[PDB]
Design an enzyme around this catalytic site. Structure first.
Site, short mmCIF file in Angstrom:
data_model
loop_
_atom_site.label_atom_id
_atom_site.label_comp_id
_atom_site.label_asym_id
_atom_site.label_seq_id
_atom_site.Cartn_x
_atom_site.Cartn_y
_atom_site.Cartn_z
NE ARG A 1 43.33 43.08 36.68
CZ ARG A 1 44.13 43.12 37.74
NH1 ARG A 1 44.09 42.13 38.66
NH2 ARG A 1 45.00 44.13 37.87
CD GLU B 1 49.20 45.70 31.27
OE1 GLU B 1 48.85 45.61 30.07
OE2 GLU B 1 48.38 45.69 32.22
NE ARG C 1 39.01 43.67 33.83
CZ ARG C 1 40.19 44.24 34.06
NH1 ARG C 1 41.26 43.82 33.39
NH2 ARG C 1 40.33 45.08 35.10
C1 LIG Z 1 41.63 44.34 40.19
C2 LIG Z 1 40.56 45.37 39.96
C3 LIG Z 1 40.72 46.23 38.91
N1 LIG Z 1 39.73 47.19 38.72
C4 LIG Z 1 39.84 48.17 37.62
C5 LIG Z 1 40.69 49.31 38.24
C6 LIG Z 1 41.57 49.80 37.05
O1 LIG Z 1 40.88 50.84 36.37
P1 LIG Z 1 41.63 51.53 35.09
O2 LIG Z 1 41.54 50.59 33.77
O3 LIG Z 1 40.80 52.74 34.94
O4 LIG Z 1 43.17 51.75 35.44
C7 LIG Z 1 41.64 48.55 36.13
C8 LIG Z 1 43.05 47.95 36.13
O5 LIG Z 1 42.86 46.61 35.71
P2 LIG Z 1 44.15 46.04 34.87
O6 LIG Z 1 45.38 45.94 35.90
O7 LIG Z 1 43.78 44.73 34.32
O8 LIG Z 1 44.65 47.00 33.70
O9 LIG Z 1 40.79 47.56 36.68
C9 LIG Z 1 38.65 47.25 39.56
O10 LIG Z 1 37.83 48.13 39.35
N2 LIG Z 1 38.46 46.39 40.57
C10 LIG Z 1 39.41 45.47 40.81
O11 LIG Z 1 39.25 44.79 41.83
#
Ligand SMILES: Cc1cn([C@H]2C[C@H](OP(=O)(O)O)[C@@H](COP(=O)(O)O)O2)c(=O)[nH]c1=O
Length: 129
Positions: free
Chosen positions: A29, A37, A75
């Site tokens: 990620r 999306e 991720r």
């Molecule tokens: C980019 C990033 C996302 N995340 C988690 C936060 C969000 O939690 P939630 O799934 O609970 O909303 C999720 C969003 O990622 P996505 O934008 O891929 O859906 O990824 C982190 O924890 N650390 C990060 O640096």
């Protein structure tokens, strides 16, 4: 920060890629960004832009920040580079992502990306049109 080697396994979308890192498959990620999306406006364009960038690259590298290296889904959290060019920064600079998810201690390139976003917005690109 330090760049480390990886190889593309599969493009996924603007937000995430499957890469081989230290010889193991991982989903990455991208730090500091959020793309729309696939169902959302500019979602397909963000995925296509990412796919092209990382599939055409001769060399993929991952760069961890100072903080957590994996999120709660397992991720990897990194800056990804394609032939030396940051994919995170490029998405923002093209108005195909927004600076987002800026957590303390994993935010080394925040100001670099915010400058890119300012430029994309000034140019009315894509999401900023
Ligand atoms: C980019 C990033 C996302 N995340 C988690 C936060 C969000 O939690 P939630 O799934 O609970 O909303 C999720 C969003 O990622 P996505 O934008 O891929 O859906 O990824 C982190 O924890 N650390 C990060 O640096």
């Amino acid at each position: 920060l330090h760049k480390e080697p990886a190889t593309l396994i599969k493009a996924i979308d603007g937000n995430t890629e499957k890469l081989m890192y230290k010889g193991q498959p991982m989903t990455f990620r991208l730090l500091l960004v959020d793309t729309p999306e696939f169902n959302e406006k500019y979602g397909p364009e963000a995925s296509a832009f990412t796919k092209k960038m990382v599939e055409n690259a001769k060399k993929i590298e991952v760069e961890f920040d100072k903080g957590q290296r994996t999120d709660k889904y397992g991720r990897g959290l990194a800056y990804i580079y394609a032939d030396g060019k940051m994919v995170n920064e490029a998405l923002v600079r093209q108005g195909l992502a927004k600076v987002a998810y800026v957590y303390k201690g994993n935010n080394t390139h925040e100001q670099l990306l915010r400058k890119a976003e300012a430029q994309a917005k000034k140019e009315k690109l894509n999401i900023w049109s």
